[PDB]
C-alpha cells in the first residue's frame, strides 16, 4: 500500500499498466456523432449559466423533464417568452401532482408529450430512464406515441406503471453491447433533497449493470459526476480544456468499499490502496496532474467527481 | 424470514411487541443539545443560507463554535449587514491552512481575539482538523492551558504548524477513557450540497466518528435535511406529533458506503422486513415518510445514514 505526491504536471507512462477502458471527459457533455443522446432535467431549480444551457440543449437530441422539472424549466426561462417557447422538452413524465396548472397548460398547449405514472414504487428518475430507453429502443413504443387517437388517453400507456411494464418487456431481449449507446446528461439530480442525491448515485451503478448502453453523467453547479469502470480506465482530456475548466477530483466508493489497485496522473497517486466511505479512506480534494490523461484502476466500479468551472465550459463545447 | 414491504395507512401506532430497542433518540435533540452534554456548532466552507432567526437560536443552543478555514469568510459575509450582530456571533476557533481566508476577514477575527490555528498538512481535511480540535478543546485540559497560558508566546499558539492538532489529538486519545468522556452534540452547517467529493467526505465523518470517537454525536443541517447516523440493531426515533407535522417531511434510509440488511422497520409509510439495501443494487428506501404517531423504529444489521426532510422556516418555534 502506497501514496505519493506528484509534481504539478507530468506525462504518465504506459509501461506496466493494462488500459482496458478509455473515456474522454468532453464526451460526457458533447455526445458522440452516432450514439443516441438525451438531456434529462430532474426536479430541482436550474441555475446552470444560460449560455451553457443553450449549448448542452443543442448537443443533445431528446429532452426529458421529470415531473416537477417542467416547472423548473418554465421558471428558468423567465426573461423572454420567445426563448421559453424555443426550448420545449420532448417528454414530461411523472405523477404530475407537482405541476402547476399554469405550467401543465403551457406545455400541453405547446404539444409536449405528457405521460402520467401514478406508481409510488419507482422514482421519477426511473420513470424517465425507462421512457428514454423505450423511445430509442422500442419501435412499438414509438408507434404508440406518434399515433393519433391516443394522446387523449395517456397515449395508450397504463396509468399506474405502464412505462415500467413496457420497459421490462422490452429489456428482456436486449443485449446491451449491441444496443446503440445513449449519452445521458442529467441536471438537478444532485444537491437537493439528500435521499434524492443518493438515489441519483444509485442510477450510475444500476444502469451500468442493468442497462449498460446508457452513459450517464450528472452536471451540477460544481461537478461532473459519473461512473468509472473497474480494471483500468484511462481518463482523457485536452490540456487546455483541463487547465481552464477543471479543478479538483475525487474517487468515491459510494455504497461499496473497494480497492484502488493503481492510479497514474493524480496529484496524489495510490497503489494497492483500500478505499471505503465507512473507514474514511477516500481520495477527496485530489486533482489531475497528467497533462492530457489520468489512469485509474480499481477492483470494482467507482464513482468519480470532477470539479468544473461552468462559466468557462462553453468555450470548449 | 421472507423479504417483505408493506404500505401503511398515513398514521399507525407501533408497539414493543417482541423487538429489541438498542437506542432511543428524539429528532429535536439533534438540534437542541441536552443540558448535561457538551455542544458545538461547526461551520464548514460553503455559503450559509440558513434563516437568520433559526441561526440565532442554534447558535445560542450550542456552546463552542468552530469555523473550518474558509468558513470564516462565509460567516463574515453571512452577517454583512449588522456589525452589532457580527460582533455578537464571533466563532471560538478558526482552523485550517488559512490560504482561502480573506485578508480582510483574517484581520477582523484576529483583532476580535478569535483563536486562529494554522495547519498546513494536505493529508487531512479541514473537517478532521476541526473535530480533532473540538475534542481537544473539551477533553484535554492541557490543550486549553496551551492556548490560554499567557507565558506562551510561541507562534500559532504553540501548535506545530504541519499536523500539531492531530499529533496532540492522537496523544490525548491514548489516555482517554471513552466510556467516561462527556458526549459532544455536534451540529454542522455547509458540509452537504457543494463540491461533491466534500459531500462524500462529510458522510464518512458520520461513520468514522461513530467508530473512532463515539462520544461525538454528529448531525448535518442543510436547507432541506437533517442527516445523521442510525446505529445498528434497533433504533427508536421519537418525535412530538405537532413538531413532526409542522417541521418534518419525508425521510430516507441510506446505506452509503456499505450495503446492509434492513431487518425491520415499524412506523414508516413503507415498512420493510428482511429487506436487503444497497446503493449498488439500487435497493434504497427513498421518499419514505414517518407514519408512526409519535415514533419510528428502524433495525438494521449495520449502521446506516438517515436523512429527515425538514421545513427550516418552521423549526424555530419548536427549538
Ligand atoms: C421500501 C420503500 N421505501 C420508500 C418507498 C416510496 N417511494 C419510492 S419511489 C417514490 C416516488 C418518488 O421517488 C416513493 C414515494 C417505497 N415505495 N418503498
Ligand atoms: C489519496 C489522497 N487523495 C487526496 C489527497 C489530498 N487532500 C486530502 S485532505 C486535503 C485538503 C482538503 O481537504 C487534500 C488536498 C491526499 N493527500 N491523498
Curated annotation (Swiss-Prot), chain A:
Superkingdom of origin: Eukaryota
Keywords: Acetylation, ATP-binding, Kinase, Nucleotide-binding, Transferase
Biological processes, Gene Ontology terms: thiamine diphosphate biosynthetic process; thiamine metabolic process
Stimuli inducing this protein: Expression requires the positive regulatory factors THI2 and THI3. Incompletely repressed by exogenous thiamine pyrophosphokinase.
Self-association state and partner proteins as the record states: Homodimer.
Role summary: Essential protein, it is the only enzyme in yeast capable of synthesizing thiamine pyrophosphate (TPP).
Further comment: Present with 3320 molecules/cell in log phase SD medium.
UniProt-recorded name of the protein: Thiamine pyrophosphokinase
The organism of origin for this protein: Saccharomyces cerevisiae (strain ATCC 204508 / S288c)
Amino acid at each position: 500500500e502506497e501514496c505519493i505526491e506528484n509534481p504539478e504536471r507530468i506525462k504518465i507512462g504506459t509501461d506496466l499498466i493494462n488500459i482496458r477502458n478509455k473515456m474522454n471527459l468532453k464526451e460526457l457533455i458533447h455526445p458522440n456523432e452516432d450514439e443516441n443522446s438525451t438531456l434529462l432535467i430532474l426536479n430541482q431549480k436550474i441555475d446552470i449559466p444560460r449560455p451553457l444551457f443553450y449549448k448542452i440543449w443543442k448537443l443533445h437530441d431528446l429532452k426529458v423533464c421529470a415531473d416537477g422539472a417542467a416547472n423548473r424549466l418554465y421558471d428558468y426561462l423567465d426573461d423572454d417568452e420567445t426563448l421559453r417557447i424555443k426550448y420545449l422538452p420532448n417528454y414530461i413524465i411523472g405523477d404530475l401532482d407537482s405541476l402547476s396548472e399554469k405550467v401543465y397548460k403551457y406545455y400541453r398547449k405547446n404539444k409536449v408529450t405528457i405521460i402520467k405514472q401514478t406508481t409510488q414504487y419507482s422514482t421519477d428518475f426511473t420513470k424517465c430512464v425507462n421512457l428514454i430507453s423505450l423511445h430509442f429502443n422500442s419501435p412499438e413504443f414509438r408507434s404508440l406515441i406518434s399515433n393519433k387517437d391516443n394522446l387523449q388517453s395517456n397515449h395508450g400507456i397504463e396509468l399506474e406503471k405502464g412505462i415500467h411494464t413496457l420497459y421490462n418487456t422490452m429489456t428482456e431481449s436486449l443485449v446491451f453491447s449491441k444496443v446503440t449507446p445513449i449519452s445521458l446528461l442529467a441536471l438537478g439530480g444532485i444537491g437537493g433533497r439528500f435521499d434524492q442525491t443518493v438515489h441519483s448515485i444509485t442510477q450510475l451503478y444500476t444502469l451500468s449493470e442493468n442497462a449498460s448502453y446508457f452513459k450517464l453523467c450528472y452536471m451540477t453547479p460544481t461537478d461532473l459526476i459519473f461512473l468509472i469502470k473497474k480494471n483500468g480506465t484511462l481518463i482523457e482530456y485536452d490540456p487546455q480544456f483541463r487547465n481552464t475548466c477543471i479543478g479538483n477530483c475525487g474517487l468515491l466508493p459510494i455504497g461499496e468499499a473497494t480497492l484502488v489497485k493503481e492510479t497514474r496522473g493524480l496529484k496524489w497517486d495510490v497503489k494497492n490502496w483500500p478505499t471505503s466511505v465507512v473507514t474514511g479512506r477516500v481520495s477527496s480534494s485530489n486533482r489531475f496532474v497528467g497533462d492530457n490523461c489520468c489512469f485509474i484502476d480499481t477492483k470494482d466500479d467507482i464513482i468519480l467527481n470532477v470539479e468544473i468551472f461552468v462559466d468557462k465550459l462553453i468555450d470548449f463545447l
